[PDB]
Ligand SMILES: CC(=O)[C@H]1CC[C@H]2[C@@H]3CC[C@@H]4C[C@H](OS(N)(=O)=O)CC[C@]4(C)[C@H]3CC[C@]12C
């Protein structure tokens with residue numbers, strides 16, 4: 001029906017409502033590290049998050065998201081494979097029922113426990129609705145999560161998830177600094193792809209960082225207590241909200257590093 005991640009509405013059904021699901025530049029993909037070409041012409045990623053203004057945290061029935069003020073150039077991505085300036089709209093995660101799955105991208109078929117997406121849109125298109133209709137409209141910065149040591153910068157997020165358990169719930173989430181979610185290295189892979197949920201628009205320049213962040217078992221367990229369902233409905237844990245790897249087709253994954 002309305003799409004989700006279950007047996008009857010999950011990724012293998014999405015093509016019926018969104019035929020671009022079987023398109024030529026779908027995401028995510030497996031990153032085959034030995035086949036990705038080092039591109040010495042790729043520039044360092046420019047991440048400018050000092051003036052970020054977070055606004056709200058929301059359970060959208062498919063993930064939770066932290067939304068930012070994107071009405072000015074306060075939190076922007078540029079350089080790397082990008083032409084121009086991309087404003088941060090929101091970040092969200094994909095995660096598993098257990099630590100051995102949850103990421104959308106894979107690395108030599110390895111699945112991480114979770115994947116963080118920082119979603120940015122190209123200011124030349126003026127708004128994100130316009131940007132998703134363009135092949136260079138969005139840049140999504142993808143960061144893998146493994147389970148081990150706690151990520152201190154994630155704790156303010158984990159501590160409010162009890163307040164947005166079910167679909168539709170939101171809360172004030174001001175003064176959150178997304179720099180606390182970044183790994184040391186900005187070494188990346190890049191390829192042209194898509195949104196990984198409906199409507200699966202082929203509008204994304206993917207930038208996937210090589211270095212995962214570590215989060216604790218206690219932090220990821222709080223993700224797994226969220227609910228896909230709305231408040232009065234049968235409880236269906238929000239887990240395994242990831243789309244599997246899609247055919248690479250006529251695409252090259254480029255590495256910023258040797
Ligand atoms: C159709 C439309 O209006 C677009 C504009 C911004 C898009 C959203 C941007 C933020 C994330 C990106 C996300 O893609 S991902 N997982 O590759 O980062 C798909 C869901 C969602 C909510 C997107 C859904 C479709 C949206 C609402």
Ligand SMILES: [Zn+2]
Nearest residue numbers: 092094117196
């Ligand atoms: Zn995502």
